[model samples]
Target: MYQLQFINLVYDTTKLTHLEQTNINLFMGNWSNHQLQKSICIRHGDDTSHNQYHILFIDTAHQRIKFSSIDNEEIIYILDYDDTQHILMQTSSKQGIGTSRPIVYERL
Candidate 1:
């Protein structure tokens, strides 16, 4: 058996916003199965003219993750997370550099 959690996030795209919306799903295992703590799904949609959508998985002790566009598929990876603020810092830096859009995770 498995437990599923869904999360939806919306961003302000009034300006030149990049990624406007994202949806995430997290899963936890049941009594019979080993606890499965993972970000099962991450999807992003850009409101700009690029018309690009990205999706990937999130796996790591750290909730910090990053995504990239390659081979028509979004690639995700864990960023260095030692301090609690590292994750937020990394996200801000990435967004500032235009490498990727800022991601906000929510539990629904």
Candidate 2:
């Protein structure tokens, strides 16, 4: 792994959003490969055996990270990383609804 951090999530197309307390730990993989391992767990105070996995890679031509679940093969353009702000902006859909709305994560 190349980087790891605890981050706070906000569905930030708006200033004040409904999504809150969606904390995550981003496990960034090798820079040369830019393969983001889907070993991250959603730390939402629940222990209900929700072990999900995904396969991700950086689309450098587009400056984004794309992913598809191990359970499914539909790929989605998932993240945009900002080195200066230290944020990863998630550009995926929510619950099969295609909004392209960004969910921003602030590194902690």
Candidate 3:
């Protein structure tokens, strides 16, 4: 049997709020060692460094967050905030590995 143990792995979309435009204060900073296995650091521009993030977009009312890169291509992330665990989970494109996996981000 394949099993995964996740702490605070809970989601109740019914009670969660969408998002507030210009007020994505939660996901504005950097992530501490942002990883959960083979992963990619969502960079801020052409930043060749880690532990830094610039909030390019935050539209809570419409459930959209964007990160502009120096490559002229941005990583668009759809966020769902669950108050229970205080986690702004990621529901993004198929940029990562297989489609069966889930990508989540936690603020440090």
Candidate 4:
């Protein structure tokens, strides 16, 4: 039981979020921190194992969010905001940039 407790020791994901995302409390809840485990599953077609784990690193200043996947590939999405919606506006295929149409992941 003691060993289990030690293994299960909770590290504050909020602290990590603030520290990593530059104190911008934009990313939160099940989508972002998912049980506070720092786990975001990026889904891809026919690549189940490769797309399992991803750590999201958001930067408010640059208006971008970085997703580091299981293959150690860094996927960046530019944040495009409106008075009504928050979106990860996607475009381009640079080694360090976003690629796709607008993907809207709402905050909780």
Candidate 5:
């Protein structure tokens, strides 16, 4: 049997975002992938429990990663190792309530 390993990241992360500190969403993470129980986890800066995203979809066209949660949200990520200025482009939707927004994670 395998175990859940915790990943650390935080104030060591993020930027002015042109956003606020409170806007800082993810701060830490952890995951377990011993078997089919694999999952990607996220921890918010000041939140208690971690967020879990499981692979609901995948692609080969691009070095991309896609995921879904129990919330039934689909997120697709395209990674570009070419440059940080280009970083990664991610697409996700809020469905009927809100809308789809493009998010990019820049490496500084």
Candidate 6:
């Protein structure tokens, strides 16, 4: 069975930001293999007037992962891994505002 682990920006080793069982079957039709079990909702930090960017991180059965962006209507990344620790880093600009970057960590 596969699992998903979520980490916060601080990279806190003591606590997990979120953890859940992956819904592998969610990928059956329109979903890509890498997006079989990941979903994210973005919250604008200190600013609520603009649309927040939502990102999803998915694990393919192969040694790869994916990062998707909702704002740009695009799949931003497909990461191939050679190590046990996978890191996802991204920066975004919403409506010409400043950039906000988020770092995510995963282990398979």
TM-score of each: 0.24, 0.38, 0.36, 0.35, 0.34, 0.26
**Which candidate model has the greater TM-score, 2 or 6?**
2
In terms of lDDT, the poorest run of 10 residues in model 6 is 24-33
Clashes of 4: 0
lDDT of each: 0.30, 0.38, 0.39, 0.38, 0.35, 0.33
> What overall lDDT, based on C-alpha atoms, would model 1 receive against the true structure?
0.30
Predicted candidate 2 versus true structure: per-residue lDDT over 1-108, tens digit per residue: 544432222122234323211112232321221344222222222223243333355354544645544455454536555553344545464457656655544433
Better of 2 and 5 by lDDT: 2
TM value for model 1: 0.24
* lDDT for each residue of candidate 3 in 1-108, tens digit (9 for 90 to 100): 222222211123344455442234443343322455322323223234433333445566654454432343344434444432333544344466654333555443
Regions of model 6 farther than 4 Å from truth: 1-57, 85-108
Model 1 stretches with alpha carbons more than 4 Å out:
1-45, 49-55, 70-77, 87-108
| Ranking 1 against 2 by TM-score, winner | 2
Which regions of candidate 2 fall more than 4 Å away from where they truly are?
Answer: 1-57, 74-77, 91-100
Q: lDDT tens digits, residues 17-72, model 4?
A: 45554423343232232233332222322333433434354555665554443554
Candidate 2 steric clashes: 0
Q: How far is candidate 2 from the true structure (C-alpha RMSD, Å)?
A: 15.6
Ranking by lDDT: 3, 2, 4, 5, 6, 1
Better of 3 and 5 by lDDT: 3
Which segments of candidate 3 are over 4 A away from where they belong?
1-22, 29-57, 88-102
Name the lDDT value of residue 51 in candidate 3: 36
Q: Per-residue CA lDDT of candidate 6, range 10-98, in tens?
A: 12223322331122112212111144354322222222333333324435455333334344644344434433344343444334555
Query: Which candidate leads the pack in TM-score?
Result: 2
Model 5 residue 88 lDDT score:
36
lDDT of 5 at 84: 28
Each prediction's number of clashing residue pairs: 0, 0, 4, 0, 0, 0
Residue 14 in candidate 1, Cα distance off native in Å: 19
